[PDB]
Amino acid sequence: MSSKQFKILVNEDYQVNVPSLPIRDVLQEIKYCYRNGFEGYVFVPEYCRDLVDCDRKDHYVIGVLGNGVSDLKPVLLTEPSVMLQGFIVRANCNGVLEDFDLKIA
């Protein structure tokens, strides 16, 4: 009752240059996405985090933290947490579908 399931395109193949945002705007964007879904976003697993580049490495993207029901939290591309599952980023590339159980940190 306290999380939501989403079908998100998973990118394991393509280098993507993605936008990043000030922390206040990523918090708002996480809230928007939790309510409205992740159209226009892909999930990049942490095991292929090298696929992601941003021009503003001082700003944030959507992080997926924890196994099972994961928390959505603003992260930097440096994020070294061992619970980092991946990033949810704006991108247009191909991929495969996976289900995610997410809630707002």
> Please, what is the Cα angle at 50 between 99 and 66, to 5 degrees?
40
Which two three-digit tokens encode residue 84? 């980092």
Class in CATH terms, 1-105:
mainly beta
- Report the Cα–Cα distance between both ends of the chain, in Å, rounded: 15
Instruction: Sketch the domain layout of the chain as residue ranges.
Output: 1-105
Which two three-digit tokens encode residue 18? 């993605």
In degrees rounded to 5, what are phi and psi of residue 83?
Answer: -95, 5
Distance CA 33, CA 48 (A): 23
Tell me the Cα Rg of the chain: 12
Report how this structure was experimentally obtained.
X-ray
Token pair 């000030």 in the structure block, residue: 22
Distance CA 82, CA 74 (A): 16
Burial-class residue 78 by CB neighbours within 10 Å (0-12, 13-18, 19+). Answer: exposed
Positive or negative, the Cα torsion across 52, 19, 33, 94? negative
Residues with Cβ within 8 Å of residue 32, at least 6 apart in sequence: none
